[PDB]
Scaffold this active site. Structure first.
Site, short mmCIF file in Angstrom:
data_model
loop_
_atom_site.label_atom_id
_atom_site.label_comp_id
_atom_site.label_asym_id
_atom_site.label_seq_id
_atom_site.Cartn_x
_atom_site.Cartn_y
_atom_site.Cartn_z
N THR A 1 0.84 -1.18 0.00
CA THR A 1 0.00 0.00 0.00
C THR A 1 0.88 1.24 0.00
O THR A 1 2.06 1.22 0.35
CB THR A 1 -0.91 0.06 1.23
N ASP B 1 4.21 1.25 2.20
CA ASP B 1 5.40 1.73 1.51
C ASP B 1 6.18 2.81 2.26
O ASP B 1 7.36 3.00 1.96
CB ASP B 1 4.94 2.34 0.17
N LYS C 1 8.49 5.37 3.82
CA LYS C 1 9.92 5.15 4.03
C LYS C 1 10.34 5.69 5.40
O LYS C 1 10.79 6.83 5.54
CB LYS C 1 10.73 5.81 2.91
N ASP D 1 13.88 8.33 10.04
CA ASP D 1 14.04 9.44 10.97
C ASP D 1 14.69 8.92 12.24
O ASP D 1 14.94 7.72 12.40
CB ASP D 1 12.65 10.01 11.27
N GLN E 1 14.20 5.03 -12.20
CA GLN E 1 13.91 3.62 -11.95
C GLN E 1 14.60 2.77 -13.02
O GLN E 1 14.67 3.15 -14.19
CB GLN E 1 12.40 3.37 -11.97
O1 LIG Z 1 14.53 0.52 -4.15
C1 LIG Z 1 13.30 0.64 -4.23
C2 LIG Z 1 12.48 0.69 -3.09
C3 LIG Z 1 11.11 0.79 -3.30
N1 LIG Z 1 10.57 0.81 -4.56
C4 LIG Z 1 9.11 0.94 -4.71
C5 LIG Z 1 8.68 2.21 -5.45
C6 LIG Z 1 7.38 1.79 -6.12
O2 LIG Z 1 6.28 1.93 -5.21
C7 LIG Z 1 7.62 0.31 -6.44
C8 LIG Z 1 8.20 0.09 -7.84
O3 LIG Z 1 7.15 0.38 -8.73
P1 LIG Z 1 7.28 0.11 -10.31
O4 LIG Z 1 6.01 0.74 -10.85
O5 LIG Z 1 7.31 -1.39 -10.51
O6 LIG Z 1 8.54 0.77 -10.79
O7 LIG Z 1 8.56 -0.15 -5.46
C9 LIG Z 1 11.44 0.76 -5.66
O8 LIG Z 1 10.99 0.77 -6.82
N2 LIG Z 1 12.76 0.67 -5.46
O1 LIG Z 2 19.38 14.21 11.61
C1 LIG Z 2 18.26 14.61 11.96
C2 LIG Z 2 17.26 14.95 11.05
C3 LIG Z 2 16.05 15.41 11.56
N1 LIG Z 2 15.85 15.55 12.91
C4 LIG Z 2 14.54 16.02 13.38
C5 LIG Z 2 13.80 15.01 14.26
C6 LIG Z 2 12.98 15.89 15.19
O2 LIG Z 2 11.75 16.26 14.55
C7 LIG Z 2 13.87 17.12 15.37
C8 LIG Z 2 14.79 17.01 16.60
O3 LIG Z 2 13.93 17.14 17.71
P1 LIG Z 2 14.51 17.25 19.21
O4 LIG Z 2 13.26 17.18 20.05
O5 LIG Z 2 15.20 18.61 19.32
O6 LIG Z 2 15.46 16.12 19.42
O7 LIG Z 2 14.67 17.21 14.19
C9 LIG Z 2 16.89 15.18 13.78
O8 LIG Z 2 16.74 15.31 15.01
N2 LIG Z 2 18.05 14.74 13.29
#
Ligand SMILES: O=c1ccn([C@H]2C[C@H](O)[C@@H](COP(=O)(O)O)O2)c(=O)[nH]1
Ligand SMILES: O=c1ccn([C@H]2C[C@H](O)[C@@H](COP(=O)(O)O)O2)c(=O)[nH]1
Ligand code: PRO
Ligand code: PRO
EC number: 2.4.2.10
Lengths: 257, 257
Positions: free
Chosen positions: A60, A90, A92, A95, A208
């Site tokens: 999904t 799906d 990603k 964080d 892709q």
């Molecule tokens: O490395 C990756 C990780 C996720 N995907 C995900 C992104 C899309 O939702 C599907 C590929 O869709 P397609 O229409 O078969 O190209 O898988 C990817 O294509 N490659």
């Molecule tokens: O490398 C990264 C990228 C994004 N962030 C984002 C994740 C959180 O939404 C804030 C950090 O929030 P804090 O409550 O200050 O730890 O920034 C991170 O902390 N480090």
């Protein structure tokens, strides 16, 4: 000493979600995951119903579903139980741990409430897994780590891929496998799912790249193909799903010997 | 030959979003971005109104906002225009180009319709930028690339960081800077925003690590601090925001000399 999917489902260290998945793959003779990259709930549900018998999993993409509601996901779960496939979201996750925990459980999507599987990038370090696990383990969910990507210029190579494998192997109570282009772990308890798959050679206009089911299951040793446009842009999506299923299944059987 | 924020806003190759941001930083004497990691719209909007004068940017986290609606984002835009700060959405775009394009524009959140800035991971290769740009450039938006992460075990180091810098420098019509722990580009047109910031030493229980505003702006050369819990867990969030603003601003002034 390569084991069938059905025997892998019984391995001592198998995760329950992986076991359920491997058992239904063997029962249904399918190692195809449909990538349901559609924007309408009716199309998602019609595809899930018609293609359910042909797939082991439906990926999904709720972030593009214009008419998402939790009721849509309830109807999807009914189809998943009926036809026997897992739901893989799906999103990603990528964080810091404190953020992915909240992203997985909350907001309007409540992903952990309906997704059997989620995937995460390993770039933040293992806190990404620890944060997800705090929600997912009580819910009996599993996670896939993105060890390789199919797109041009992917940085998920070399030491990065090795770090993803180590992170999975050290978090085996929650991590059940990988998004990868090949077999990356030697441990048979882990699932390898491979996107970037089409019957014909080529790619798209945005990086892709495609390889065939025979290449990725048969030569590269992956377990499951993830297929989006090769199915969803076809006129007859059921016939297309069957061609991909038969390709991936035969490639698996031939490698098993 | 280090230029002030106000002079950087006039650089020949500056992106319009970066220019707007640098001008309001100089006008308001703030290089603080509030990380509004809250689950309630009322708290988001009350924080945006009270802290608006003290910040150059508010980082939204719509995936955890339990009562998200597009009307909430309209009210946030009113506050952003009133108090003069940019809106930066936290969503970690990190997919193939074809997917990020749809994730940015569509679904229930319509991020591109209200976010001045988004951030992306570079792991998929440059298609991640090309897909986002196809939506963002017509909308006059900008993007930040995640070149380094603050969390323990981060893989965004070495060659990965170098690849993020190259990808930014080659897509300067859309990429306006970085999420990083330090200055990573030598080109002054790019903004460096640094999360993982608190006045006191420490971390969290899920891999977050903190450094001080003086360290990250003054010694490490970054432009903007991103602060979540150091402000939002404080009793008086206005006073906390002012302490962080004064710390980051003085550190910038001292480095400029
Ligand atoms: O490395 C990756 C990780 C996720 N995907 C995900 C992104 C899309 O939702 C599907 C590929 O869709 P397609 O229409 O078969 O190209 O898988 C990817 O294509 N490659
Ligand atoms: O490398 C990264 C990228 C994004 N962030 C984002 C994740 C959180 O939404 C804030 C950090 O929030 P804090 O409550 O200050 O730890 O920034 C991170 O902390 N480090
Ligand atoms: O020869 C090849 O690589 C391609 C694979 C799919 C069809 N032909
Ligand atoms: O000495 C140190 O590194 C820390 C920085 C914040 C307060 N003390």
């Amino acid at each position: 000493m390569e084991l069938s999917f059905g025997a892998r489902a019984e391995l001592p260290r198998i995760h329950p979600v992986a076991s359920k998945l491997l058992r239904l793959m063997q029962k249904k003779e399918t190692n195809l995951c449909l990538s349901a990259d559609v924007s309408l709930a009716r199309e998602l549900l019609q595809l899930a119903d018609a293609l359910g018998p042909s797939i082991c999993m439906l990926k999904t993409h709720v972030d593009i579903l214009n008419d998402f509601t939790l009721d849509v996901m309830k109807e999807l779960i009914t189809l998943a139980k009926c036809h026997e496939f897992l739901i893989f979201e799906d999103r990603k996750f990528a964080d810091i741990g404190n953020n992915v925990k909240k992203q997985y459980e909350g907001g309007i999507f409540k992903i952990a409430s309906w997704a059997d599987l989620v995937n995460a990038h390993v770039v933040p370090g293992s806190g990404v897994v620890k944060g997800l696990q705090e929600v997912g383990l009580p819910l009996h969910r599993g996670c896939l780590l993105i060890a390789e990507m199919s797109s041009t210029g992917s940085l998920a190579t070399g030491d990065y891929t090795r770090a993803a494998v180590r992170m999975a192997e050290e978090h085996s109570e929650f991590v059940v496998g990988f998004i990868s282009g090949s077999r990356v772990s030697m441990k048979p308890e882990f699932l390898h799912l491979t996107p970037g798959v089409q019957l014909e050679a080529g790619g798209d206009n945005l990086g892709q790249q495609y390889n065939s089911p025979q290449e990725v299951i048969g030569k590269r040793g992956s377990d499951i193909i993830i297929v989006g446009r090769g199915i969803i842009s076809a006129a007859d999506r059921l016939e297309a799903a069957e061609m991909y299923r038969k390709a991936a299944w035969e490639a698996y059987l031939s490698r098993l010997g």
